């Protein structure tokens, strides 16, 4: 028998029936913190230092490790491109802070795409443009300060392969598509027009099935999520493909009494982790 | 006695006299291939591969190792800056080919400054601009093809700290200075106005006291010199300071009979070796 079944190479063993020389012709048969509940760093004044930069959190049980997996360089068993990759390390795996957003009582919510956010920032950006192939994980840190008299709750989540959709002309008759500035808004991010369906026909209420953390003003002022590289290929174009989107949505609206500070910003600070590149040539912006 | 003599820390031992608590107050006393003759790679179709690039020479006894020292990263004993450096490796230590020069029967000679030549080229350039501190060695490869009926000889030499001077207004009364485009001509290099004195009041005839190789058309079509990092400090600005100049001077003029190919170019291909950077910040061009 040829070992060409789709399940060949998995830890689970199935008992199947077959009458042909190819394994995939066989019957499906029968088989014979949790990765999905946003595992905290512990389950798997504080200071996270990476490169020449340091942010300050409070607890390791407050850092989510997406899918329970820490970022890593691509192993030889999964690699396919044969050139030696460049792993610049400290010049690219460090914290970059993007433009700050302003949280208002009627804000809808925002999203950023990765690695799009940094393709034009620092040495990371340069490497992303000079190489065809890119790969990395990310430490995502969202910051929001308010007083003990303010209230509100942001859901901060990482949605892998965040494909956006349109309102189809309102009536649903128009097969319109999101424009480039909407699918890859860059460093400044973009605003959601229908946060309830994440501008993609899926419920915000179930977004917690993805790696996430809440920023509930009365309890915390920051959220930190560590994201491993996720894709169906070991390396990919940092320009053509965004591996995941970061969503920051006010599920419980911001509120405070008149006279309390009304300028409440939200700041995103991100650090590539284990960034590596391959397929060197001239710089390409898109 | 305080061990504060200028010779403290050298391999040579001197027998001196002293009457004071400070060692430097002491008398000079008495003490008690060759590095300068351009050591070949052997003394210390061929293919030199570095990064994603390969050049083809012929012999290892045809590669000069300047001062008999191979490029190396800065050792901890000599380092002073405390941040972890970035050593991008294959994206910067690889061969870059500059604009080709045209050798004419009356050409004076050319020079290029390092690392100026590559501060705006590739990932090396980006790192040189994003970091305050830079350091590296270089593999310098000069190419010139001609027929068995052509004749001529180029002296290819590396002059550390190649400070240029002016003709002082011709009369010698004007304290003029070389302009920026002359001291750091960039990738295209520059032409010598008085090659006999290297545009610096010193004899071209003694330039062979520096690492060099001849390109004598009847025998060879290329010269390769490997240069270690040389400076009075372990790292320095790639923008403000050029560690050495590359000089290509036709000591025996090009000649050939009418009808033989008259377009005889000279091409320079260089590869940074062990390039490292530190003191990261925003990109600075100069």
């Amino acid at each position: 028998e040829n070992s060409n079944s789709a399940s060949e190479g998995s830890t689970i063993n199935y008992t199947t029936i077959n009458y042909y020389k190819d394994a995939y012709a066989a019957s499906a048969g029968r088989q014979d913190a949790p990765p999905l509940k946003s595992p905290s760093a512990e389950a798997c004044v504080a200071q996270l230092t990476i490169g020449n930069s340091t942010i300050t959190t409070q607890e390791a049980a407050n850092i989510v490790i997406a899918y329970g997996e820490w970022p890593e360089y691509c192993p030889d068993t999964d690699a396919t491109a044969v050139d030696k990759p460049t792993r610049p390390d400290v010049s690219v795996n460090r914290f970059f802070t993007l433009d700050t957003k302003s949280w208002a009582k009627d804000s809808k919510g925002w999203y950023w795409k990765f690695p799009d956010v940094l393709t034009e920032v620092g040495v990371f950006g340069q490497n992303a443009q000079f190489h065809y192939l890119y790969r990395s994980g990310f430490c995502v840190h969202v910051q929001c300060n308010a007083s003990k008299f303010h209230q509100g709750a942001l859901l901060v989540a990482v949605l892998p392969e965040y494909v956006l959709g349109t309102i189809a002309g309102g009536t649903g008759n128009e097969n319109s598509h999101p424009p480039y500035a909407t699918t890859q808004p860059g460093q400044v991010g973009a605003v959601l027009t229908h946060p309830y369906v994440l501008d993609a026909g899926i419920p915000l209420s179930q977004l917690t099935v993805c790696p996430h953390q809440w920023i509930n003003l009365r309890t915390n002022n920051c959220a930190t999520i560590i994201v491993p590289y996720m894709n169906t290929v070991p390396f990919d174009s940092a320009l053509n493909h965004c591996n995941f989107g970061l969503l920051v949505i006010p599920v419980v609206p911001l509120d405070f009494n008149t006279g309390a500070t009304s300028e409440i910003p939200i700041t995103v600070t991100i650090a590539p982790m284990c960034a590596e590149f391959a397929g060197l040539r001239q710089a390409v912006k898109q | 006695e305080n061990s504060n003599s200028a010779s403290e820390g050298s391999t040579i031992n001197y027998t001196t006299i002293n009457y004071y608590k400070d060692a430097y107050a002491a008398s000079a006393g008495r003490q008690d291939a060759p590095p300068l003759k351009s050591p070949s790679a052997e003394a210390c179709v061929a293919q030199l591969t570095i990064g994603n690039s390969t050049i083809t020479t012929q012999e290892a006894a045809n590669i000069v190792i300047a001062y008999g020292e191979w490029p190396e990263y800065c050792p901890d004993t000599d380092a002073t800056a405390v941040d972890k450096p970035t050593r991008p490796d294959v994206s910067v230590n690889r061969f870059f080919t500059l604009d080709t020069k045209s050798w004419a029967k009356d050409s004076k000679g050319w020079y290029w400054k390092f690392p100026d030549v590559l501060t705006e080229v590739g990932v090396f350039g980006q790192n040189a601009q994003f970091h305050y501190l830079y350091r590296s060695g270089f593999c310098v490869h000069v190419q010139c093809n001609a027929s068995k009926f052509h004749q001529g000889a180029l002296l290819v030499a590396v002059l550390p700290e190649y400070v240029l001077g002016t003709i002082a207004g011709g009369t010698g009364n004007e304290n003029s200075h070389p302009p920026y485009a002359t001291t750091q001509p960039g990738q295209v290099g520059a032409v010598l106005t008085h090659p006999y004195v290297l545009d610096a009041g010193i004899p071209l005839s003694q330039l062979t006291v520096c690492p060099h190789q001849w390109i004598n058309l009847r025998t060879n079509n290329c010269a390769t010199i490997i240069v270690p990092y040389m400076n009075t400090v372990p790292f320095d600005s790639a923008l403000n300071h050029c560690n050495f100049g590359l000089l290509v001077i036709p000591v025996v003029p090009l000649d050939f009979n009418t009808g033989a190919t008259s377009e005889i170019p000279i091409t320079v291909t260089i590869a940074p070796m062990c390039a490292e950077f530190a003191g990261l910040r925003q990109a600075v061009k100069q």
């Binding site: 890593e72 360089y73 691509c74 192993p75 030889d76 030696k84 990759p85 792993r87 | 060759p34 590095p35």
Partner: peptide, 20 residues
């Protein structure tokens, strides 16, 4: 164990001359 495999010139006196 490792996921990635790729990761004195002048002496005190002048030289003597030897008979051929």
């Amino acid at each position: 164990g490792d996921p990635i495999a790729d990761m004195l010139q002048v002496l005190p006196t002048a030289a003597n001359t030897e008979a051929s």
